[PDB]
Design a protein around this ligand. Sequence first.
Ligand SMILES: Nc1nc2c(ncn2[C@@H]2O[C@H](COP(=O)(O)OP(=O)(O)NP(=O)(O)O)[C@@H](O)[C@H]2O)c(=O)[nH]1
Ligand SMILES: [Mg+2]
Length: 160
Amino acid sequence: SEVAIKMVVVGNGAVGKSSMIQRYCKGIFTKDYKKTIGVDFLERQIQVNDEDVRLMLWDTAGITKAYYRGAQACVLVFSTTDRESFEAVSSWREKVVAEVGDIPTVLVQNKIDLLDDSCIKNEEAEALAKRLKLRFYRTSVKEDLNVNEVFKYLAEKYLQ
Ligand SMILES: Nc1nc2c(ncn2[C@@H]2O[C@H](COP(=O)(O)OP(=O)(O)NP(=O)(O)O)[C@@H](O)[C@H]2O)c(=O)[nH]1
Ligand SMILES: [Mg+2]
């Protein structure tokens, strides 16, 4: 037997959800932006506590019922250069809780490589994560920076 975990990745359009999943599961950086059509399924096998676990990442455009059904962990994503995507974070957390209840969740500020054009103050983001009682990562899918740690953390939080 091998444990599988269904993970959803949610957040406003263009924050980098598909890119994060394609980086994590296939090791590529998708530079072109196309809004995701339908639901896409990707997976990666990782070892947590020396046991192989299969992460099943569900990707859709930022359907509702089937997408969230059986979700076991969640990545909440906003973008360093998209203020509206940050201001919607609380609303996304309420939406996941309403649909699947209390599951392991992590908060991610993506595109941290564009920090020269940031519209989110470091204290603002860290405060939001504290209020929502969520661990917080700053990632760059483009630079493969902290992407692996986001998903390993969720897998450890689910298995423990
Ligand atoms: N500079 C930079 N661009 C990024 C990063 N991650 C993703 N992008 C870019 O952001 C754009 C949108 O990314 P995408 O993964 O499609 O976003 P999405 O959240 O899946 N959008 P949708 O909800 O419409 O499907 C793409 O041009 C992609 O290359 C990052 O870390 N840095
Ligand atoms: Mg997408």
